[PDB]
Structures are given as structure tokens and as C-alpha cells.
């Protein structure tokens, strides 16, 4: 769905804005690198707990993450 | 965390706003009643796909759901 694609898009977009590799985000989020690469391809099985770990590894607040997601849905769906 | 608890809270609040039982939401969302009850107690392991199923069963937009979650975090965290 658009939602599942854009959860993945927003993760990747923030990661790269911050100059972080997948390897860096894995370390900071406490999730292994293959998990990160998978959820950036398809977010279907990403859990709320893992998403919170990823937001902490990205050093973005949940509010800001969710607001970027909403903007992506409004402007592109 | 506050986020995991408020995901649970917002699901449940919208459910009651729509006048639905857990069994009603289970049938509409394609997730069984023990999964619904469980995620309303603790959203840790709720997935993005299951959250989309639940939003469809609640007949609420993803944008409305995430805006209600942002409002709860801003005002109460």
C-alpha cells in the first residue's frame, strides 16, 4: 500500500538526511543491519516497538516522524 | 513507553467512537479477537500491516489516526 511504502520511504529519507548508513542506523537502533535493509524495502512486518527503536536511532521525535508521514500521504496519495 | 501505550489508547478510543466491540473490530479488520485485545493492552508487537488493517476496520484514515496520536503525545507527554 501507499502507507507501507511511505513508512519505509520516511525512514530512509531521514536516515540519509542525517548522513547515516544502514549499518549506522542498525547500531543506533539496536536492530541488525539486515532487518533495517528489509524494512526499508517493505515495512509490512515492522512493529511499533521497532519503529520506536528506529526513531531513537535516527534521533527524531515520534511527532516529527508522524508529521513527515502525514505530509507524504496528503501531498502524494 | 508513552508511544506504545498511546497507540493502544487511540485504537481503543476510535473503536468506542465507532460504537464497536472487540469482536466487531476483529471481524472488520481481519484479525482475531485475542489479537485485538492483546494490542489494546500493549501495542509493542503490532505491525504496520496490522495497524493498516485496524484502520480499515475502524473506517478511519491513516492521516486522522496519526493526527490523533500526535495530539495525545503533544498534550500528554
Author numbering:
A (entry chain B), B (entry chain A): 3 to 79
Which text from the study accompanies this structure?
The most widespread of these mechanisms employs a “controller” (C) protein encoded by a gene downstream of its own promoter, and usually co-transcribed with the endonuclease (R) gene as a single transcriptional unit. The C-protein binds at various sites within the C/R promoter to regulate transcription of its own gene and the associated endonuclease gene. Unusually, in the RM system Esp1396I, the C-protein also represses the MTase (M) gene by binding to the promoter at the transcriptional start site, denoted OM where the C/R genes and the M gene are transcribed convergently from different promoters. Flexibility in this loop is very important for DNA sequence recognition, as it has been observed in the nucleoprotein structures to adopt different conformations depending on which operator site the protein is bound to.
The side chain positions could also be placed with a higher degree of confidence. In terms of crystal contacts, Y29 does not stack with a symmetry related Y29 residue in the manner observed in several C.Esp1396I crystal structures. A large number of crystal contacts occur through the C-terminal tail of C.Esp1396I and symmetry related chains. This gives that previously flexible region a high degree of stability, allowing the complete C-terminus up to the terminal carboxyl oxygen atoms to be modelled. The other primary intermolecular interface is centred on one of the SO4 ions. The SO4 ion essentially bridges the gap between symmetry related chains as in this region no direct protein-protein interactions occur. The wild type structure of C.Esp1396I presented in this study revealed further details including an additional, third conformation of the flexible loop region that was subsequently observed in several of the mutant protein structures.
